[PDB]
Symmetry: C3
Subunit: 302 residues, 3 copies
């Protein structure tokens, strides 16, 4: 009898039957209201038998699997605040609409009984973070919340190596799917060695064993963008470095720099960034559903 959880029938049953469920951040429905994107991700997850679970906050409730009605508002309403783990309390108390970030979502996902969550890119150590200390709450949320997060590594505007170092310090397992290098978002690789996992059944058995030993906490699973859709590393690096020089002469610091680089990157891809991002998103999502199916099967042995 949970007062805060709002779970749809399909997801409730799936969990109640130890069937696989894959959590998704509300952002995906917010950005593209057209069936084009939302329907394709759902398609990619359902393929392996996993139930897609889009998570949001609405009317003082932690909604797991938004209704068609709620999907409408998240598309129409413009001023919906981004909610990480720390913003949840206020977001509920306010009773408005809350678009949950990576950190915020996995907390709710765990509470609902969901064990797998997916996104194109996670947060991490911002570039110049060693000085600025701008670090996503995601990384320390992974120490607390039991989950497997399936992504393509950290968002490209971040410092990939420093992020890997921070996660190593924080003791978060990082597995590379059929790869031994860390996935660098739209770029395929970063010069960072990760523990290879060629089989998802094996990988699901590594996480299960991890939770039995280290207790609750996130297993991070990286799946790099298909090489046919990958963006050249040198293109991304020189574009960011140049955009940083503009902020040096203009004199921009803090979380004003962050959205600058995001949109400066969109130009330098030749307008190919959205298609590369969407391509990764889909390949990643497909993997998550497959893993979640594997994980449910491993857990169904005991």
């Amino acid at each position: 009898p949970d007062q805060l959880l709002e779970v749809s029938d399909e997801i409730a049953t799936a969990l109640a039957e130890r069937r696989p469920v894959v959590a998704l951040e509300s952002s995906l429905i917010t950005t593209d209201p057209s069936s084009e994107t939302a329907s394709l991700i759902e398609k990619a997850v359902r393929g392996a038998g996993a139930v897609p679970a889009t998570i949001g906050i609405a009317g003082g409730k932690l909604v797991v699997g938004l209704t068609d009605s709620l999907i409408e508002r998240f598309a129409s309403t413009k001023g919906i605040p981004k909610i990480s783990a720390r913003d949840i309390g206020g977001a509920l108390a306010g009773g408005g609409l809350g678009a949950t970030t990576v950190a915020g979502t996995i907390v709710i996902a765990e509470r609902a009984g969901i064990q797998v969550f997916t996104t194109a890119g996670i947060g991490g150590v911002h570039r110049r973070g060693e000085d600025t200390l701008d670090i996503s709450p995601d990384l320390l949320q992974f120490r607390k919340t039991k989950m497997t997060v399936v992504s393509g590594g950290a968002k490209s505007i971040l410092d990939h190596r420093l992020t890997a170092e921070y996660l190593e310090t924080a003791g978060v397992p990082v597995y590379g799917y059929r790869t031994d290098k860390l996935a660098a978002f739209v770029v395929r690789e970063a010069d960072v060695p990760v523990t290879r996992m060629d089989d998802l059944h094996t990988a699901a058995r590594a996480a299960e064993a991890h939770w039995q030993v280290n207790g609750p906490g996130t297993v991070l699973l990286t799946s790099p963008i298909d090489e046919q859709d990958a963006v050249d590393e040198a293109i991304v690096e020189a574009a960011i470095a140049e955009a940083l020089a503009q902020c040096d002469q203009e004199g921009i610091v803090g979380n004003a720099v962050s959205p600058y680089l995001m949109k400066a990157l969109a130009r330098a891809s030749g307008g190919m960034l959205p298609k590369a991002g969407r391509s990764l998103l889909l390949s990643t999502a497909r993997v998550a559903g497959e893993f979640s199916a594997a994980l449910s099967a491993v857990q169904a042995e005991r």
Copy 2:
């Protein structure tokens, strides 16, 4: 039947009756033994109906609400060690007097059943911390201990922005009371956006919901110094920067720099620092008692 807790009658009853209680660090009694300061803080807390609870360590016990007898020693004895969370074990084992810091106090406060603690300023990221790694244990204690800490932000000798960044990484909610900027101790504002809370009942409902979702952990509530008593930001900044240059040419590093800046700041205020500090302390304390009363009321609904 707790062997380590020493709780006075008034506080025991108040907790046993779900009545509001506000924790205070022993430092306040230590510094000014005169009724002048101690009586005024107690007055400010009791106003809203909250029971003041001064916490210390004495004779291998975690004393919650010091007796008149103990208050005497904390005033007379000169060599009383400062005790943070990590020093507690030894402090008890030694059986001496222990003046608990912010980090140390909230641990004991939680253990006793207290949910609200107040101080003028909390610890944080020291200036040049990005290089020196000098960071108060307070910030990571807030991940563990369930409490609402009511302060005026970080002590002025610290790096306010970096502290805000560290707390964001650590997932500690920061609420500004009727303000949207972070309180910078004796200075009213720092250029750091905080989540606004205009009503303490609303704010108490945000914390309660936070604990139900993210489990135990501190909600940090900032209440800026009354503007009529606020110290000019530019006065504080130039005074510290100059004092830092003296340590550069003298060649001072580490926790030798910290007390230097503290006392160099006292001069540059025109001797107005103690009155500005005491003014903030009182306004902050009054808020804490009011919040604690609100929190008890929210919790009394279930």
Copy 3:
């Protein structure tokens, strides 16, 4: 009925009878298969009545006290991976041999019921860590796992001061045995004040009280190398600084720098490093067994 633990008879009984047990990392058997080193450490621990417990991973099991058969493989097999806390899940899932690091061992030690672990040196903040963010997972593992770790501080290739700062932020108690300065591995002292503990019975009562207040988490106990065997600080510092300059002109960054400094240090000691390391290892181990005996006795009072 634990499926993952593999405990030898002697250790099982010792724990089942609240008798002292001291955990050891598998590395010691791996490096020197000759009875020379392994027999002497075992001798040093058993002296105080403590049961030595060497921990490893083999055939999907968390082996506590390796058999003569397993000791053979850890000596003969060359490609045995180093396993920290985060690597455990995969290591078990793989069913190979896993040589557990400091971080990995204490997790298993706790699970088995062991409360004391020893090593010559622990991990910490790497030199230039304030920029590189290269920090051992050990330091944040100490927030989670209940244990007393007996060492000679951080390995000499690390930044001792920054490590001390990081552990202070993380709220890990650091006690110096009959010393008030932090032990700097083969070098006796680092210019860092630590809380003095002259009596191990007192020290064991400080840890016990710490766990009762701050819950699970590591108490770190430093015991400096016997001065008669200590290496001059200036020798170590100038040797490392020079070795760093070689990596600057050669252009080496990351975890390629780490093993460089390790082996560059071995030369500059005049070949005395192994004997100084082994000397510390033994003095440290002897202390651990004595402490574990004291701790068991304190706990046997209730």
